[PDB]
């Protein structure tokens, strides 16, 4: 019933300029692959994970 308050970290999203999809008559290929390698991660830079 009462509004709840808590502190939350900001989150941001990053993408390559790669766009692939499926459509009838489409010139695009269907199967795609990519990888992400983690170098540094701070589990708790703030109270929120």
């Amino acid at each position: 019933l009462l509004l709840q308050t808590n502190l939350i970290n900001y989150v941001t999203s990053i993408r390559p300029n790669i766009f692939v999809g499926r459509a009838e008559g489409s010139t695009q290929y269907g199967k795609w692959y990519f990888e992400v390698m983690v170098d540094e991660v701070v589990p708790f830079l703030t109270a929120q994970a």
Partner: protein, 48 residues
């Protein structure tokens, strides 16, 4: 939704995540450090 993988752990340094997309099924799959991830997304919308 939890997914089972060998050496299951939260994304840590030196980890490598391999993401695979098949638009025919459709299906999305992952591998962790070359190890299979025992879960998949499928039957999702292809509007975009």
């Amino acid at each position: 939704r939890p997914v089972t993988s060998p050496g299951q752990h939260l994304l840590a340094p030196e980890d490598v995540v391999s993401c695979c997309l098949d638009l025919s099924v459709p299906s999305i799959s992952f591998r962790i450090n070359g190890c299979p991830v025992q879960g998949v997304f499928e039957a999702f919308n292809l509007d975009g």
